[PDB]
Amino acid sequence: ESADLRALAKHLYDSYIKSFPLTKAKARAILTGKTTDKSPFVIYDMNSLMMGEDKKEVAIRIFQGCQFRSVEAVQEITEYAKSIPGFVNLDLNDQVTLLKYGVHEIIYTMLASLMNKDGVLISEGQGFMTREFLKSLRKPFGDFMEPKFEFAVKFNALELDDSDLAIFIAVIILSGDRPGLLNVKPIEDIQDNLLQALELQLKLNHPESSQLFAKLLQKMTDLRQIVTEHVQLLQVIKKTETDMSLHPLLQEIYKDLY
């Protein structure tokens, strides 16, 4: 029923606030300068990057920075998943599978919140790295962020807020079609209810946004292609940048992925 769907929506929003210290609302306030005493440090070149260290080669430093950020996000997203009703009762192997296949899709969703066409917030919003600086990085590091910016500009045009995002993220995590899932039915049942909640949320929160629900569902499929592309890049780096290795948590996620 409708009241149940709204209580679910609100529960997910509350869990989202509890799990993710930097929200889209906060990020947008920083990006448009509608905040008090906190104007972010801009990284646009090598010298800019040097100055921002107080507050290896350049491309590796950036790469390793994304990795540390990524492991923090994995921890936050796991804490969020555990508050999705029904999730912690799933077979624990299926929870691992859901997390393994869903976590990067969520990371790139939430990255969009921190992005505009010109760059991305770093260091909990204390810094801003330009899209152009990231593009300047040597092969094969210079192309890693471009598909994420491309996605973000179009995704951000949908004007979703944190309350919409909380349900969106939950729907993605509870995907019954991940490889290796033992018990698909209970996952699909939870996702079905989350989808109803999302549909009602989008209708009430954005009544005049045409076919918003359909548009959002398509974005979920687009996210998988972004992950695919990123994984391909990571295999290039593993093969040809042999001195390096991923953080152990990231190694675990990427091992036997697809």
């Binding site: 804490e79 948590l249 675990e252």
Partner: peptide
Amino acid sequence: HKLVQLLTTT
């Protein structure tokens, strides 16, 4: 291994 630990922490 690490994912299981994160999933079962209280």
